[PDB]
């Protein structure tokens, strides 16, 4: 197993990071709580389990509640593994790096936790549970900030997991793309994606966005239309995948016919998107790229005669935000919108990323151009009304909008666009 | 017809509300749909699950921050959440029965709620939120018990919704069955079910159980094997569907070849299952049927020579529970395991389970317009079989035959049946699911 070799280095890195912070904050150790199952109100049914990101940072156990990791960075990390033996229920490489204790029932954990928890930092969601167990330090900000800062630097093990994540997601994206050109409904396209990725809905790192025509302009679109539209014009799919707790996050936009103004508009955004990806470089502030994206959107708006102005004028008047209202992208890893994106240092001192770009960091680059009713209405109420080609806006509105998103690893002397290296056009 | 039936539904809920607020000296009742739960340290959210007490009034189950204010005399007030931000996209029959006011942001609901919330009962999950608004009565038990008791009596509207929920589920079960005989994996079978029901995973009222071979013996099996088994022997699917907040809950078990001892075992269990369905009748304690199920499971174990005893002997020695460890079934409606099933009166008193089965919680006396599941089972579970082998009943068990039947896992057959005054309506088998 190639992962096993890399994982040995991963643990050693986390141990080193753990040593530094527990010594700095004068702690005996850190306790990571995987989480618990949430029960639905007045019911005996449960929400799907979502593991604490700080927990799965150590190991690929993301489907098991009531698990505990006790670490100080010097000794082997203690893993309290939940494993019920009741009759209604029911070894790998990472197992050898932990001292594993089996937990048969949730409230039996206290006998397995350290006796004096005065200087053990509880890292988890369930503060009432932590207090009941005797923990007093819960998610200490210096500790959270330290881990979150270094989470931006992915180990070789993590990079491998994120590559496999894209690989699965790209398979889904190609299958979804094929379903679109066959005239399938949003629901059917989603089924094709889930089938190709072999993912259940709750396996996807975020709710898939599967939008046809006007629905493409809906930034937080979640629904899946069961009925295919009479006419197929555009398709926007924002979807990813999971591998070992690590996420992919990819968006592609398609014109149905492959020709016409919207088809050219998509391709223009593509060339801009690729150009923005290749601007990723160590020592460079991510905010610089976001600014350049606005320039490129303004040029696009100008070239396609959507706004009757030059690119620089569109930027100065603040018109671009009407068509591109969100951030250029974000760090990605264990979390889709990964932590540490705003941090200037370990202490912890719209756009989701402003942090200086360094090697071993992973980003998304997702420029967008949309025709959104409420935003266009606001623009029409300003003095910029005169500058807008409203006829052109009316022409492109039925196509909804455009977003193109890749996941890129930044290396010291090169860039690794995982998504496009997997040949997803 | 649904629009017509819904008028009577609202009238019924109004009258129930009038009775309970008068009895408990209340000004009204507030039903909170709930909120979206955010994942720890993240900006991703859990799927929204609506408060059952809220969707009891209306078919709005995908909307948080909604509030219903009712006293049973005036029209029920519906505070409907409907944001206008540019990230979101911005009149059915049920709308006319509510005085609707739109809520654009969740923290603006206080302006729409009653001024004096002292005698207004808050029915919701978010206590500190309600306390912050001014509410003081948090899910008062006499109010909870009263509503939950009468929740057992489904209105004509609710029955119609449950028929449709069952109609959808059966379409899935047929597609799943076909996939099984085509030799597909558990994951592929689940995909077929979701497609045929046009359900997303989070639309299903519970996590589907799609089990092949030995997995059929796992009662709380949740995984979906991506790899098809090299040998195809058995298939158990426990799966339902949603319509307007109401649930279906259906189980079927299949033998792959349709021949052999396990195939005959499934066939025998089916005839028992149908017979148990027809035992549903007004005036009977549900525990009476549970007892008969154990008798029939014992008879099956005896006839197939799995246990070398008569049916009475197997029951008396408490051996049946090794092969049939759970309850015969439950009330079903807005919730899969619906409320009120253990209540003797509307005060919340418990109808005690029959002797020998202290863990049976569906015990309430059967009446018309109540909806039940009938799910007898016969499984071969390692843990329970191990327990049996350690007892003095070890000598009575045909262990060689058990070993031959173990790779097939187990059997469960489940329908959803409406009890009427004169007849029984097996919704599942009416929809032509063998
Ligand atoms: Mn120190
Ligand atoms: Mn210090
Ligand atoms: Mn995305
Ligand atoms: Mn993204
Ligand atoms: Mn041009
Ligand atoms: Mn069931
Ligand atoms: Mn059931």
DSSP state of A358: -
Residues of B in contact with A191 (CB under 8 A): 191, 194-195
**Alpha-carbon gap, residue B218 to A88, rounded angstroms:** 6
Longest C-alpha distance within chain A, in Å? Answer: 72
- Does residue A294 have a known ligand-binding role? no
Residue A129 near chain B (CB below 8 Å): no
Contact between residue B21 and residue B29 where contact means Cβ atoms under 8 Å apart: yes
**Alpha-carbon gap, residue B343 to B320, rounded angstroms:** 27
- Contact between chains at A221 and B187 (C-beta distance less than 8 A): no
Q: Which of B46, B206, B381 sits opposite A47 (nearest CB)?
A: B46
Contact between residue A401 and residue A369 where contact means Cβ atoms under 8 Å apart: yes
- Return the closest-CA partner of residue B284 out of B224, B205, B351: B351
Residues of A in contact with B198 (CB under 8 A): 187, 226
Query: Can you say whether the dihedral through the CA atoms of B225, B231, B232, B235 is positive or negative?
Result: negative
- Contact between chains at A335 and B44 (C-beta distance less than 8 A): yes
Find the ligand nearest to A28 CA: 1
Contact between residue B247 and residue B334 where contact means Cβ atoms under 8 Å apart: yes
**Alpha-carbon gap, residue B14 to B72, rounded angstroms:** 4
Q: What are the backbone dihedrals phi and psi of residue B387, each rounded to the nearest 5 degrees, phi first?
A: -60, -40
Breaks (C-N over 2.5 A) in chain A follow: 90, 349
- What's the N-to-C CA distance of chain A in angstroms? 31
Please name the residues in contact with B73: beta carbons below 8 A apart, sequence gap of 6 or more.
Answer: B14, B18
Shortest Cα distance, chain B CAs vs residue A123, angstroms? 11
DSSP-derived 3-state class of residue B237: strand
| C-alpha A265 to ligand 7 mean position (Å) | 53
The residue extents of the domains of chain A are 1-151, 152-425
- Pairing between β-strand A120-123 and β-strand A137-138 as defined by DSSP bridges: parallel
Segments in B33-105 forming alpha helices (H): 52-55
What is the Cβ-side half-sphere exposure of residue A119, based on CA atoms within 13 angstroms? Answer: 10
- Return the closest-CA partner of residue B326 out of B281, B295, B296, B293: B293
**Which residue bears the tokens 């986390």?**
A14
- Return the closest-CA partner of residue B177 out of B105, B108, B254: B254
**Which residue bears the tokens 């909804």?**
A400
Residues of A in contact with B241 (CB under 8 A): none
Please name the residues in contact with A315: beta carbons below 8 A apart, sequence gap of 6 or more.
Answer: A294, A295, A298
Q: What are the backbone dihedrals phi and psi of residue B159, each rounded to the nearest 5 degrees, phi first?
A: -60, -45
Residue B191 near chain A (CB below 8 Å): yes
- Contact between chains at A187 and B206 (C-beta distance less than 8 A): no
Would you state the structure tokens that stand for residue A274, as one six-digit string? 């690729």
Beta strand ranges found along A310-380 (DSSP E): 361-365, 368-370
Crossing angle between the packed helical segments A156-181 and A2-24, to the nearest 10 degrees: 120
**Alpha-carbon gap, residue B98 to B103, rounded angstroms:** 15
DSSP-derived 3-state class of residue B38: strand
- Does residue A225 have a known ligand-binding role? no
Taking CA atoms, A245 is separated from A334, A336, A358, B313, in Å, by 6, 10, 23, 53
**Alpha-carbon gap, residue B261 to B234, rounded angstroms:** 12
- Contact between chains at A372 and B190 (C-beta distance less than 8 A): no
DSSP state of A282: T
Q: If you measure CA to CA, which chain B residue comes closest to A41?
A: B125
Segments in A127-205 forming alpha helices (H): 127-133, 141-150, 156-181, 186-197
Q: Which of A40, A194, A337 sits opposite B191 (nearest CB)?
A: A194
Residues of B in contact with A197 (CB under 8 A): none
| C-alpha A119 to ligand 2 mean position (Å) | 13
Contact between residue A324 and residue A369 where contact means Cβ atoms under 8 Å apart: yes
Residues of A in contact with B124 (CB under 8 A): 41
- Contact between chains at B87 and A54 (C-beta distance less than 8 A): no
Question: How is the beta sheet containing B28-32 ordered, strand by strand?
Answer: B99-103, B77-81, B67-70, B28-32, B120-123, B137-138
- What's the N-to-C CA distance of chain B in angstroms? 28
Shortest Cα distance, chain A CAs vs residue B423, angstroms? 30
Burial label for B100, CB within 10 Å (0-12, 13-18, 19+), is: middle
Q: Compute the 3-state secondary structure of chain A and give helix, strand, coil in percent, each to the nearest 5.
A: 40, 15, 45
Residues of B in contact with A144 (CB under 8 A): 41
Contact between residue A362 and residue A286 where contact means Cβ atoms under 8 Å apart: no
Taking CA atoms, A222 is separated from A208, B102, B107, in Å, by 7, 21, 23
Task: Identify residues whose C-beta is under 5 A from ligand 5, the ion.
Answer: A 303
DSSP-derived 3-state class of residue B281: coil
Residues of B in contact with A89 (CB under 8 A): 218, 220
Would you state the structure tokens that stand for residue A181, as one six-digit string? 């050109």
Domain topology for B1-151 = Creatine Amidinohydrolase; Chain A, domain 1 (3.40.350)
**Which residue bears the tokens 């709620």?**
B113
Contact between residue B81 and residue B64 where contact means Cβ atoms under 8 Å apart: yes
Residue A88 near chain B (CB below 8 Å): yes
Method: X-ray
**Alpha-carbon gap, residue A178 to B347, rounded angstroms:** 59
Among B37, B51, B87, B89, the strongest candidate for a mutation testing the A interface, having the largest count of A CBs within 10 A, is B89
**Alpha-carbon gap, residue B197 to A26, rounded angstroms:** 56
Supply angle C-alpha A316, A308, A291, rounded to 5. Answer: 35
Q: For chain A, what's the residue count?
A: 425
Contact between residue A307 and residue A314 where contact means Cβ atoms under 8 Å apart: yes
Q: Which of B47, B85, B224 sits opposite A200 (nearest CB)?
A: B224
Residue B219 near chain A (CB below 8 Å): yes
- Contact between chains at B89 and A124 (C-beta distance less than 8 A): no
Q: For chain B, what's the residue count?
A: 434
Would you state the structure tokens that stand for residue B110, as one six-digit string? 């206080």
- Residues facing residue B356 across a β-bridge: none
Give me the total of CB pairs closer than 8 Å, taking one residue from chain A and one from chain B: 110
**Alpha-carbon gap, residue A193 to A195, rounded angstroms:** 5
**Alpha-carbon gap, residue A277 to A167, rounded angstroms:** 19
Contact between residue A239 and residue A173 where contact means Cβ atoms under 8 Å apart: yes
DSSP-derived 3-state class of residue B102: strand
CATH class of B152-434: alpha beta
**Displacement of CA A86 from its chain's centroid (Å):** 36
Q: Which of A41, A124, A372 sits opposite B86 (nearest CB)?
A: A372
Write the DSSP string, A201-219: GGGSSS--EEEEGGGGG-T
**Displacement of CA B138 from its chain's centroid (Å):** 26
Would you state the structure tokens that stand for residue A291, as one six-digit string? 């600014």
Supply angle C-alpha B303, B306, B308, rounded to 5. Answer: 80
Segments in B182-260 forming alpha helices (H): 186-197
Burial label for A65, CB within 10 Å (0-12, 13-18, 19+), is: middle
- What is the Cα gyration radius of chain B? 24
CATH class of A152-425: alpha beta
DSSP-derived 3-state class of residue A141: helix
| C-alpha A222 to ligand 3 mean position (Å) | 12
């Amino acid at each position: 197993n190639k992962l096993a070799v890399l994982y040995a280095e991963h643990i050693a890195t986390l141990q080193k990071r753990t040593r530094e912070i527990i010594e700095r904050e004068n702690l005996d150790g850190v306790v990571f709580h995987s989480g618990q199952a949430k029960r639905q109100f007045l019911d005996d049914m449960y929400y799907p389990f979502k593991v604490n990101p700080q927990f799965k940072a150590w190991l690929p156990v993301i489907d098991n509640p009531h698990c505990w990791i006790v670490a100080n960075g010097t000794d082997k990390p203690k893993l309290i593994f939940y494993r019920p033996v009741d009759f209604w229920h029911k070894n790998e490489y990472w197992a050898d790096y932990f001292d594993i204790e089996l937990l048969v029932k949730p409230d039996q954990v206290e006998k397995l936790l350290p006796y004096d928890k005065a200087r053990f930092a509880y890292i988890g969601e369930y503060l009432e549970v932590a207090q009941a167990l005797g923990f007093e330090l819960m998610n200490p900000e210096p500790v959270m900030n330290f881990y979150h800062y270094h989470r931006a630097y992915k180990t070789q093990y993590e990079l491998a997991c994120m590559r496999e994540a894209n690989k699965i997601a790209v398979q889904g994206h190609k299958a979804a793309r094929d379903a679109f050109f066959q005239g399938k409904s949003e629901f059917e396209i989603q089924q094709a994606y889930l089938l190709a990725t072999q993912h259940s809905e709750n396996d996807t790192p975020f709710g898939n966005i599967v939008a046809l025509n006007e629905n493409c302009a809906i930034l937080h679109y979640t629904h899946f239309d069961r009925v295919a539209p009479a006419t197929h014009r555009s398709f926007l799919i924002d979807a990813g995948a999971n591998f070992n707790g690590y996420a992919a996050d990819i968006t592609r936009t398609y014109d149905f016919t492959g020709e016409g103004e919207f088809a050219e508009l998509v391709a223009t955004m593509k060339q801009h998107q690729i150009a923005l990806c290749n601007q990723l470089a160590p020592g460079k502030l991510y905010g610089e790229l976001h600014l350049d994206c606005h320039q490129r959107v303004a040029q696009t708006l100008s070239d396609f005669n959507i706004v009757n102005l030059s690119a620089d004028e569109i930027v100065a008047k603040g018109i671009t935000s009407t068509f591109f209202p969100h951030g250029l992208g974000h760090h990605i890893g264990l979390q889709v919108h990964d932590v540490g994106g705003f941090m200037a240092d370990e202490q912890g001192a719209f756009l989701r990323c402003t942090r200086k770009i360094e090697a071993n960091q992973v980003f998304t680059i997702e420029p967008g151009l949309y025709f959104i009713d409420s935003l266009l209405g606001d623009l029409a109420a300003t003095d910029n009304n005169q500058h807008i080609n409203w006829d052109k806006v009316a022409e492109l509105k039925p196509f909804g909008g455009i977003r193109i998103e890749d996941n890129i690893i930044v290396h010291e002397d090169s860039l690794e666009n995982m998504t496009r290296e997997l040949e997803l056009d």
